[PDB]
Ligand SMILES: NC(=O)c1ccc[n+]([C@@H]2O[C@H](COP(=O)([O-])OP(=O)(O)OC[C@H]3O[C@@H](n4cnc5c(N)ncnc54)[C@H](OP(=O)(O)O)[C@@H]3O)[C@@H](O)[C@H]2O)c1
């Protein structure tokens with residue numbers, strides 16, 4: 001079995017759409033592409049490089065295409081994404097010029113990929129795919145960066161796939177710019193008492 | 196001008212309905228009342244006894260009535276809620292036997308309270324009222340506690356009144372149970388750029 005880690009940049013109110021630039025995702029006329037920009041720091045970069053260790057990848061087709069437009073030409077900065085096998089969920093695209101690209105069509109394919117052998121799987125972006133993962137409880141770890149801004153509109157990490165589920169805080173840090181690094185692990189059912 | 200601080204317990208996906216008990220808020224058949232109970236420890240008790248220092252209070256009617264059923268008899272534990280003035284937003288309640296309770300009816304009345312001279316203001320619970328405060332940018336500070344669960348259902352802090360806005364992280368902390376404490380201050384317009 002493989003460890004599927006979802007990594008995600010979110011606002012205070014959970015919005016994940018277009019973190020890196022004004023045209024990254026204009027669905028809905030989203031006006032706030034690039035909201036992570038004013039919060040990029042040195043410390044933040046060091047955290048990123050630890051998360052940019054080579055591994056395998058599971059991506060939604062849109063996130064894969066966004067990546068394919070940029071990252072093959074910058075294999076220096078992020079080698080793992082070029083070197084590791086990228087598993088892409090799509091009914092639309094069955095081939096890519098990007099090296100190490102395998103295309104999956106159904107939930108069963110994702111599951112077999114989990115029950116396979118190989119490097120642990122990272123999931124970046126891919127909010128729509130993440131909803132299917134959450135709904136079938138296939139995500140084992142969550143690495144969030146939480147940014148000191150609120151934007152009502154936008155695609156959300158915790159969307160229509162989210163399920164009642166408990167987590168364990170594995171690690172937390174704070175950047176100088178005010179971003180909170182919080183990594184969690186799945187921990188069984190939700191507990192309620194009376195305070 | 197008075198400072199308005201919103202204090203709020205939320206899940207990872209932003210839910211804040213019924214932290215304290217199975218029956219605190221059964222709206223929608225909400226099954227997870229009490230989800231905050233398993234994350235209670237000593238050091239969190241010290242964290243939030245100083246968060247409960249004497250102030251004035253602005254509350255929605257439902258939160259006020261939840262409080263009024265319990266706290267008048269536990270002024271031992273939280274004397275601030277009893278001694279401070281509780282400004283309550285309601286169009287259906289004009290009086291309470293809980294002493295030092297004034298009932299306001301309008302946005303104009305909240306604005307007048309903010310302008311008027313007196314102690315700083317704490318908002319607890321009051322998700323619906325908080326929506327009106329957010330939409331009118333009347334919230335000066337946000338003290339949050341984030342819990343390692345997702346619930347999918349239930350009322351949320353960032354709801355219909357949430358507006359685009361940036362914040363400064365005043366301070367942060369973790370809890371042995373895995374709860375992040377994050378205190379933010381309002382800091383102007385959302386800035387965008389390119390990474
Ligand atoms: N905050 C962050 O960390 C971060 C980082 C990078 C990107 N992002 C943002 O993430 C978003 C990515 O776009 P997106 O989430 O809307 O789409 P996506 O998940 O990246 O990919 C969408 C495509 O993947 C396939 N797919 C995904 N789920 C499927 C399902 N349950 N059943 C069948 N096919 C499924 C489908 O491909 P086919 O149509 O080909 O069949 C679907 O159209 C963007 O907003 C991006 O800016 C966020």
Ligand SMILES: NC(=O)c1ccc[n+]([C@@H]2O[C@H](COP(=O)([O-])OP(=O)(O)OC[C@H]3O[C@@H](n4cnc5c(N)ncnc54)[C@H](OP(=O)(O)O)[C@@H]3O)[C@@H](O)[C@H]2O)c1
Nearest residue numbers: 203204213220255256257258285286287320321322323324
């Ligand atoms: N996570 C936490 O920190 C925390 C702590 C405590 C409680 N809570 C939860 O907070 C929730 C409180 O219930 P709630 O948010 O639904 O209601 P609420 O905000 O506490 O009070 C609702 C009532 O206040 C008045 N009101 C609120 N907004 C108004 C507006 N914009 N205009 C006019 N009147 C307004 C109305 O009173 P009238 O109907 O009389 O006109 C409204 O019915 C509960 O779920 C509670 O469990 C959370």
